Structures are given as C-alpha cells and as structure tokens.
RNA sequence: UUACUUAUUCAAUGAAGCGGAGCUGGAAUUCAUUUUCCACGUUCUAGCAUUCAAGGUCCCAUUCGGGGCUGAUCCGGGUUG
RNA sequence: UUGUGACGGCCCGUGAAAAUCCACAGGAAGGAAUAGUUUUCAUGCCAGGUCGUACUGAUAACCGCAGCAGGUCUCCAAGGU
RNA sequence: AUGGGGAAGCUCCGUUUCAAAGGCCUGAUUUUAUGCAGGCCACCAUCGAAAGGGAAUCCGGUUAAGAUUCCGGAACCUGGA
C-alpha cells in the first residue's frame, strides 16, 4: 500500500496510447465472409416478391419440436438395422421359403425432393415439411403452391440440416409423412390442425404479402430523424 | 566502420552517462532540464486549473 | 506522317519524372480520429529541399495514438515554420500558421495551403511555392466551404477538407530570371525530359502539323478544336481568344 | 451466442494443422549408392615434372579429381584411401576442364613415401 | 429542381473509434413530458509517454502470485467517407 | 602527386538507396557464503565450401574480311629548360 | 512471378494492389509428440553493379611458365557448448 502509486492513464484524444479495445466491429473480414454478410443484407434490402419470404415464415420452436419428435419416432432404418433385416429375410426364405413378406410393412418418413413431390402429386402425403435454407430457392419455391393445390398440409420448417438429421443425412430440404400408426394418428391430426392454421389457410394472404425492403441501422436512424424534425412543429 | 564496431569492447562505443553513446552531454543536460521543468509546470497548471474550477 | 512529340510523351518511356532525389510524397496526416474530434501535436524535425519542388518540405513527427510508435509525415512547409516547432492538426487546433484545421473550423479570409479537394485525400490544392487558398465563405447546411484557388477559380468543397494555415514557403521563385540555358537545363534535369523545346514550325511536315514550307509559318490557324485528335492537338487547344490581352486576372 | 474479442482489426489465416507425408509407395524404391565415393573423387595422380617436384619438395600430392568434388571430399577421400593425414587442399580447374588438387600432408607423412606406395616414383 | 440505397462508380485505412445511448455541474423559453453542446484533465519549452496498466472491489489452500468486474459505459456488428 | 583537415564560393541544380553493424530509455528473467554473474576483459579449441585467377589489352593477342596508320575505359608518372 | 483483372489466344497489365499471403526461444524434449490456453509480432517474392555499398593478409623467398593464392615468418575476420 505505501509502495503503490496511482498511474491513471488519461485516454484523451491526444494524451496516452489507447488501450486494447475490442475492434471486432472493424475487422477486415475475408472476402467470403464479406460476401456472406452482404448477400444477406442485399436480400433484405431488396423487395422480395411473395414467392420468397413466404419462407422465413417458419413455424415456431414449440410446434417444430413436436413435429420433429413425431418424425424422429417415424425415423428411417439405419444401415445396421437394414443389414440385420436382410439377413433375417435371407434366413427366412432359406428355412421356410417365405414370400419375402415376413418383415412388417415399414412406417418411415419419406424424403427426397422428387419422391416427396411425386407423393404430393399423388395425394399420398399426409404432411410435408419444407426447409427454408435451400441454396437455389426454385427447388422448393413451388412447393407451397403444390401443397395448396393438392390439399396436403405443409409447414416451412427451420433447418435443412435438421431434416437431414431426421432422415439420417446432412441435408434433406424436404420431408413427408404419407402413412401413420394409429397410436399417434391423433397427435399427427392435432399437429396438422395448427400447421394448417399457420400455412394452408393463410396461403392466399401469404401469396399477396410482399417481403423485404428493410434498410440498415443508420438509414433507419436517418429517416427517424427526418420524420421527427418534420412532424415537430 | 559499422562492422568494426562489433569487435570492440562496450566502453569504446558509449559514455558512462545516461544516453551515453547516443546523445551529446549538452543534449542530455537540456533534456533533463526540460523534462523536470515541463513536469513541474504541468503540476502547477493542474493545480491552478483545479483551484480556479473549485473557486468557480 | 509520324507520331509527334506530344503524342510520344504519353507512353512514358523517357518522359517519366526523375524521382531519385525526391524526399517522398508530401501528404497530410491521415484523417483518423484525432484530426476530426480533437487535435494532435507533432514536431517539425527538419525542413529540407525536395528536388524538382520549389517549396521546402517539412518532416513532422507525430505520436501513434494506438501504438507505441512515432509516425513521420512529409508536409509542405509554409512560411515561418521552423525546426522544433509544434504543429497542431485537428478540428480543435488553433488558427496558427502551420496547423491543419478543417475549413469548417477556419473562418472567412483564412489563408490556407495544401487544402484537401475531398476530405481525407491528404492535400491537393495550393501546394506549389508561394501559393494559397482564400476561404471565401461557408454554408453549414450541407456543409460546404467556398474557396478561392490560386488561379482565381471558385471552388465549393466539403467543410471537412483539411489544410495547413499560411502560404507555401519558397515564394517569389519565378521573380528571378534564369539567365541561362544552363539554369533551365539544371531546373528540368530533375523534373522531367521536357526541355529544350524545338518549335514545330522548324520541323518537317512528317514531324508536326506546323512543319514544312519554304518559309517557317504555321499555315493554318493555330487554334485547335477541343474535338480534335492526338496528332492534331498541337497549338492553342480550344482557345476562346488569342493575342495580347489588355487586362488583369481579376480572380 | 456472443462473439470473441478481436483486439486487432486484421484477419490472418488461421494456423491449421500441417500433416507430415506418409507415402503409400516409395518414390524411387532404391536409394542411389554413394555418387561421389573415395574412388570417384580421386581419379588418378598427376605425374608431370612440376607435380613430381611438388611431391619431392613441398610434401604435396598432386591429383586429378572429380569435377564435382570439393576440398572436404578430397580431404576425406585421401584420408580413407591412403591412410594419411592431409594438412591443406588447394584445387583448381585446369584449362582442359578437369579438377587438379594439391593435397599437402602433415609433417608426419612423406609425399614421396606415399607416391612410391601408390606406384608412381 | 429533387428524396432512398441496395446495383454500378470514386477514395482512405494495419478496414480504431461510425450511427444512436447517460452520474454531479454549465449555455440554463422547460409553462416539472427534457430538444443540442462541455468539466469526458492534450497549446510558453526540439523532454517522457511502450510489459494483459497503475489504483479500486470479493475470494484463492500460497513458492514465479492471481481470477472476474472496473479502470476503458451500453446497443446495432454498415470499416469510413 | 596523393590523402586528410578546418574553411569559403555555387545552384529556381542543394548532389536519393538497401543489406549489414553498433548504441541508447526498459528490467520483463538471478544469486547474497567451498558458489551464484561474466565468452561486449584477456588466454586457450576447430572450421571456413563453390567458381575466376595463365597471357595480350593493341601500329600483331579485341573490333574493323588482315599481323588494317582507324576505333576501344582506366591507375602509377624521374631530371633540365 | 504471385493475388487479381484483360485477351479467341500466343499472352498483356499489375508488384501490394477489392488476397484468409510468415518466421526464433524455453516449458513441451519419451508409460505421449515437434502435437500444445507457451511469447513477439507483421519484412509486405525475386532478379538487377567483377567501377556503387561490403568482414577479414602482409612482408621476404620460390617457377620455364602461378602467386596479396605456393613456402617461411607474422596477423586478422566470420561462425560454432
């Protein structure tokens, strides 16, 4: 205490060397990082037609959790289970010469964009989940219209990676249930009611609603200041 | 020569004073005087600013 | 014909400037934070001759606000600046000769030099020896300072553009006769290969629009259109008038 | 999810892991034998009148040497061939394009002795 | 004659302080519903200004001494014009 | 004759570089008692590779068809008048 | 050269530019490697002078022809616990 002094460095505009402040707001980010940020910014600034921006209307976290829990219960069979099943069928057709139908009918979530689109065309699909992160949007941009035409409930969900985990891949971009078990048919119907409440019946409004057109922080502040000084009379 | 400076002893390349082999004796004296005087004036200026603000 | 000399001067082979002896580009301090919110004090370490430049240069040392480092800048010296002098660059710097205030901070009638054309370009206007800029006036809304340039031109520029206070040192230089092709030779030897000048009228018609004839005469009018082309633009380009003029500059 | 403090506004390439080569086959499959061995760097002696005077007087062997040999290899090869200790090696490239080495041995050894051992008087 | 910025265009920087936020006191038209700036220790001197910073706050199983906050405000991640 | 030194003229001409080598504020890292500091003080150990190197350089060794009165950069420089 | 951008292309520009651009000390230095919250950070390829800058050798002797290079003597510099 008697040997310690009070230094304090004065960080005025020309007094002392500045301390190591966090300069994350000024980092010279790499080109790919900058393109990522500016691509998102430009997509927000531009007036996106109702065909896009009907996406980014993803169902909320709670119902997404219920839907993905139901689908995870309806998850496909892994490779080890597939090999087990094939070996058991080989044994069955070896010993009883069974007609390859000893195995029960599977109940799995249908995935694959072409497969699911054909299922919707055939009206087989009970419920269809459409991701929002597909890099070319045209792959699924017509899907809400197709589901509305064929009367199959659809939900725009968050995460093609989530759908890929659901169907044991990295990315699925679409998932679909066409058949259900009676033990959770009631759960599926309850889920479909809310999913339809969000998407299938609000479809006409979603097709009229134009998205985008949001300006940056400084631009919002600028128009705020202009409006404030205009109506301040 | 600059490379010859590497072979010689340290006492040939400096002076026992502070800033020895870099600055002149009169330079060091002028800088000592300037440092002390300007710091004393800084103390006086700080005190006079504080006292005039306290009066105000 | 042939490619004429003023055409050849653009390929930049022997007509590039002789930059060996030069002391560096004479630019203001970069417009970082202190120059626009406060001031920063540097010291004029030395005032030196720059070859090809009639004005002396000032080597001013500033402290680095963010790192323990000394930043040396090469200024265009104004009259009165001396070694050991303190230079104050910034928005809050005082109206003293050698300071680098913005035009918004300086008042009307101020004599400024090394004035930035746009804020942060580190000095473009009134840099030759003896030259200066007059602060004609301000316009705070959509901040613009009107200034008078050394040629008499009116220029509206941003109120954030920096500029050193005073007149450029080394004035009166062109008041002395060179008296000698030798003095002209040494003047241009370290500027560029633009001397001596053969008259185009003394060339052959292959070498110039003016060359040829049994008498040394231009032949056609020496006033050339602005819409002329390279090889044609030799003479008086886009001249509004010619001949001796009875008048003064009148800004 | 917060961010990290970036004290410097400069982005630098991250120090990613640098693996070491683990080839699945050998490149040449047989290491070349010693290109410049003692019998290759020492080609043959030189038996001019001047060279023999050097051997008799200066305690210096004179040799024709591989053009790719240096004084280190000449020293080592003379040591390994003739079991002598050499003092200095001075090489030159002759106007006929061959390396000539003057190898001065120590006082322990006699150049004339070793020349008679090699075979040239 | 204009407004927006996000395309395109022009510059600078090691892309460092951009746009909006407040203790005690000041200019104090404010009819107790706060609109804008400063004390946020930089101007007589050719000095010095760097060790996660000294000081300040609760603890460490103690032998190189420390840890969080603060010093150095928060929010938006549009480097800025 | 050459080198060096202190000077004095000249310029709108003021006669730039880089490697490399030293030095200067700092004490971050150590110890006091058969040792802890010094390889910027003396002494002692070892090594120093590669390529060029001969000769002419000119009224005969270069170029000009040649052993051509031509052309071709430079250093040293005795005595008398 | 590169990064980038032109050009049908041979190639042209550009030389730090709208680029995520690298290297020396002890801890790690063996039931486990050069893997690691171990530190400083930020030259901004390269080529370009046998007259520019630059680490250090002299004397005497020796050959038919080489010598500041060989020999004798006497030194110096650079790099290595």
UniProtKB/Swiss-Prot annotation, chain A:
GO terms for cellular component: cytosol; cytosolic large ribosomal subunit. The keyword Amino-acid biosynthesis does not apply. Belongs to the eukaryotic ribosomal protein eL8 family. The keyword Cytoplasm applies. Component of the ribosome, a large ribonucleoprotein complex responsible for the synthesis of proteins in the cell. The small ribosomal subunit (SSU) binds messenger RNAs (mRNAs) and translates the encoded message by selecting cognate aminoacyl-transfer RNA (tRNA) molecules. The large subunit (LSU) contains the ribosomal catalytic site termed the peptidyl transferase center (PTC), which catalyzes the formation of peptide bonds, thereby polymerizing the amino acids delivered by tRNAs into a polypeptide chain. GO terms for biological process: cytoplasmic translation; maturation of LSU-rRNA. GO terms for molecular function: RNA binding; structural constituent of ribosome. Component of the large ribosomal subunit (LSU). Mature yeast ribosomes consist of a small (40S) and a large (60S) subunit. The 40S small subunit contains 1 molecule of ribosomal RNA (18S rRNA) and 33 different proteins (encoded by 57 genes). The large 60S subunit contains 3 rRNA molecules (25S, 5.8S and 5S rRNA) and 46 different proteins (encoded by 81 genes). PROSITE patterns: RIBOSOMAL_L7AE (PS01082). InterPro entries: eL8/uL1-like, Ribosomal_eL30-like_sf, Ribosomal_eL8-like_CS, Ribosomal_eL8/eL30/eS12/Gad45, Ribosomal_eL8/Nhp2, Ribosomal_eL8_euk. SUPFAM superfamilies: L30e-like. It is found in: Cytoplasm.
Swiss-Prot record, chain B:
Disulfide bonds: none annotated. It is found in: Cytoplasm. Present with 23600 molecules/cell in log phase SD medium. Component of the ribosome, a large ribonucleoprotein complex responsible for the synthesis of proteins in the cell. The small ribosomal subunit (SSU) binds messenger RNAs (mRNAs) and translates the encoded message by selecting cognate aminoacyl-transfer RNA (tRNA) molecules. The large subunit (LSU) contains the ribosomal catalytic site termed the peptidyl transferase center (PTC), which catalyzes the formation of peptide bonds, thereby polymerizing the amino acids delivered by tRNAs into a polypeptide chain. Component of the large ribosomal subunit (LSU). Mature yeast ribosomes consist of a small (40S) and a large (60S) subunit. The 40S small subunit contains 1 molecule of ribosomal RNA (18S rRNA) and 33 different proteins (encoded by 57 genes). The large 60S subunit contains 3 rRNA molecules (25S, 5.8S and 5S rRNA) and 46 different proteins (encoded by 81 genes). Belongs to the eukaryotic ribosomal protein eL34 family. This is Large ribosomal subunit protein eL34A. It comes from Saccharomyces cerevisiae (strain ATCC 204508 / S288c). The lineage of its organism: Eukaryota, Fungi, Dikarya, Ascomycota, Saccharomycotina. The chain holds residues 58 to 113 of 121 of the full protein.
Swiss-Prot record, chain C:
GO terms for molecular function: RNA binding; rRNA binding; structural constituent of ribosome. It is found in: Cytoplasm. PROSITE patterns: RIBOSOMAL_L2. It comes from the Eukaryota. GO terms for cellular component: cytosol; cytosolic large ribosomal subunit. SMART domains: Ribosomal_L2, Ribosomal_L2_C. SUPFAM superfamilies: Nucleic acid-binding proteins (SSF50249), Translation proteins SH3-like domain (SSF50104). Keywords: Cytoplasm, Isopeptide bond, Phosphoprotein, Ribonucleoprotein, Ribosomal protein, RNA-binding, rRNA-binding, Ubl conjugation. InterPro entries: NA-bd_OB-fold (IPR012340), Rib_uL2_dom2 (IPR014722), Ribosomal_uL2 (IPR002171), Ribosomal_uL2_C (IPR022669), Ribosomal_uL2_CS (IPR022671), Ribosomal_uL2_dom3 (IPR014726), Ribosomal_uL2_RNA-bd_dom (IPR022666), Translation_prot_SH3-like_sf (IPR008991). There is a cross-link at residues 45, 92, 118, 144 (Glycyl lysine isopeptide (Lys-Gly) (interchain with G-Cter in ubiquitin)). The modification Phosphoserine is found at residues 51, 94, 158-159, 248. GO terms for biological process: cytoplasmic translation; maintenance of translational fidelity; ribosomal large subunit biogenesis. There are 2 genes for uL2 in yeast. Component of the large ribosomal subunit (LSU). Mature yeast ribosomes consist of a small (40S) and a large (60S) subunit. The 40S small subunit contains 1 molecule of ribosomal RNA (18S rRNA) and 33 different proteins (encoded by 57 genes). The large 60S subunit contains 3 rRNA molecules (25S, 5.8S and 5S rRNA) and 46 different proteins (encoded by 81 genes). Belongs to the universal ribosomal protein uL2 family. This is Large ribosomal subunit protein uL2A.
Curated annotation (Swiss-Prot), chain D:
This is Large ribosomal subunit protein uL23. Its main location: cytoplasm. One of its GO terms (biological process) is ribosomal large subunit assembly. One of its GO terms (cellular component) is cytosol. There is a cross-link at residue 40 (Glycyl lysine isopeptide (Lys-Gly) (interchain with G-Cter in SUMO)). PANTHER family: 60S RIBOSOMAL PROTEIN L23A (PTHR11620). One of its GO terms (molecular function) is structural constituent of ribosome. It holds the Pfam family Ribosomal_L23. InterPro entries: Nucleotide-bd_a/b_plait_sf, Ribosomal_uL23-like, Ribosomal_uL23/eL15/eS24_sf, Ribosomal_uL23_CS, Ribosomal_uL23_N. SUPFAM superfamilies: Ribosomal proteins S24e, L23 and L15e. Keywords: Cytoplasm, Isopeptide bond, Ribonucleoprotein, Ribosomal protein, RNA-binding, rRNA-binding, Ubl conjugation. Belongs to the universal ribosomal protein uL23 family. The keyword Ribosomal protein applies. Component of the large ribosomal subunit (LSU). Mature yeast ribosomes consist of a small (40S) and a large (60S) subunit. The 40S small subunit contains 1 molecule of ribosomal RNA (18S rRNA) and 33 different proteins (encoded by 57 genes). The large 60S subunit contains 3 rRNA molecules (25S, 5.8S and 5S rRNA) and 46 different proteins (encoded by 81 genes). uL23 is associated with the polypeptide exit tunnel. Signal peptide: none annotated. It is found in: Cytoplasm.
């Amino acid at each position: 205490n008697p040997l310690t002094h009070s230094t304090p460095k004065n960080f005025g505009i020309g007094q002392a060397v500045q301390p190591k402040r966090n300069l994350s707001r000024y980092v010279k980010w790499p080109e790919y990082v900058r393109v990522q940020r500016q691509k998102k910014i430009l997509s927000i600034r531009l007036k996106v037609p109702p065909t896009i921006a009907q996406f980014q209307y993803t169902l909320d976290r709670n119902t997404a959790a219920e839907t993905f829990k139901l689908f995870n219960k309806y998850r496909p069979e892994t490779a080890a289970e597939k090999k087990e099943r094939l070996t058991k069928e080989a044994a069955a057709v070896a010993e009883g010469k069974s007609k390859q139908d000893a195995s029960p009918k599977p109940y799995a979530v249908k995935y694959g964009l072409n497969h699911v689109v054909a299922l919707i065309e055939n009206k087989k699909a009970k419920l269809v989940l459409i991701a929002n992160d597909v890099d070319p949007i045209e792959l699924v941009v017509f899907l809400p219209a197709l589901c509305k035409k064929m009367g199959v409930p659809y939900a725009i969900v968050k995460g093609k990676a989530r759908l890929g985990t659901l169907v044991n891949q990295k990315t699925s971009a679409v998932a679909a249930l066409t058949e259900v078990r009676a033990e959770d048919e009631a759960a599926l119907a309850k889920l479909v009611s809310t999913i339809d409440a969000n998407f299938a019946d609000k479809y006409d409004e979603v097709k009229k609603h134009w998205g985008g057109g949001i300006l940056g922080n400084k631009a919002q502040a600028k128009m705020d200041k202009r409006a404030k000084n205009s109506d301040s009379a | 020569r600059p490379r010859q400076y590497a072979t010689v002893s340290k006492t040939h390349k400096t002076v026992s004073r502070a800033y020895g082999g870099s600055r002149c004796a009169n330079c060091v004296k002028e800088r000592i005087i300037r440092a002390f005087l300007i710091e004393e004036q800084k103390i006086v200026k700080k005190v006079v600013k504080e006292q005039t603000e306290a009066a105000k | 014909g042939r490619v004429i000399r003023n055409q050849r001067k653009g390929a930049g082979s022997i007509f590039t400037s002789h930059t060996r002896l030069r002391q560096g580009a004479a630019k203001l301090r970069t417009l970082d934070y202190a120059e626009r919110h406060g001031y920063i004090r540097g010291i004029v370490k030395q005032i030196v001759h720059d070859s090809g430049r009639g004005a002396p240069l000032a080597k001013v040392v500033f402290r680095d606000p963010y790192k323990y480092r000394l930043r040396e800048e090469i200024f265009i010296a104004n009259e009165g600046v001396h070694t050991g002098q303190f230079i104050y660059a910034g928005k809050k710097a005082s109206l003293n000769v050698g300071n680098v205030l913005p035009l918004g901070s300086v008042p009307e009638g101020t004599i400024v030099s090394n004035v930035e054309e746009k804020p942060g370009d580190r000095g473009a206007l009134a840099r030759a020896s003896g030259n200066y800029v007059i602060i004609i006036g301000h316009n705070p809304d959509e901040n613009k300072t009107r200034v008078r340039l050394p040629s008499g031109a009116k220029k509206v520029i941003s109120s954030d553009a920096r500029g050193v206070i005073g007149v450029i040192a080394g004035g009166g230089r062109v008041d002395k006769p060179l008296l000698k092709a030798g003095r002209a030779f040494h003047k241009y030897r370290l500027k560029r290969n633009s001397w001596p000048k053969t008259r185009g009228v003394a060339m052959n018609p292959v070498d110039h629009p003016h060359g040829g004839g049994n008498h040394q005469h231009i032949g056609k009018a020496s006033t050339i259109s602005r819409g002329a082309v390279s090889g044609q633009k030799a003479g008086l380009i886009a001249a509004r008038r010619t001949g001796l003029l009875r008048g003064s500059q009148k800004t | 999810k917060a961010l990290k403090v970036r004290t410097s506004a400069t982005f630098r390439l991250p120090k990613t892991l640098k693996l070491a080569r683990a080839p699945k086959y050998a490149s040449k499959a047989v290491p070349h034998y010693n290109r410049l061995d003692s019998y290759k760097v020492i080609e043959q002696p030189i038996t001019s009148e001047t060279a023999m005077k050097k051997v008799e007087d200066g305690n210096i062997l004179v040799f024709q040497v591989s053009m790719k040999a240096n004084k280190y290899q000449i020293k080592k090869a003379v040591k390994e061939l003739y079991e002598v200790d050499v003092l200095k090696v001075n090489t030159l490239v002759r106007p006929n394009g061959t390396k000539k080495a003057y190898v001065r041995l120590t006082a322990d050894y006699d150049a004339l002795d070793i020349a008679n051992r090699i075979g040239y008087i």
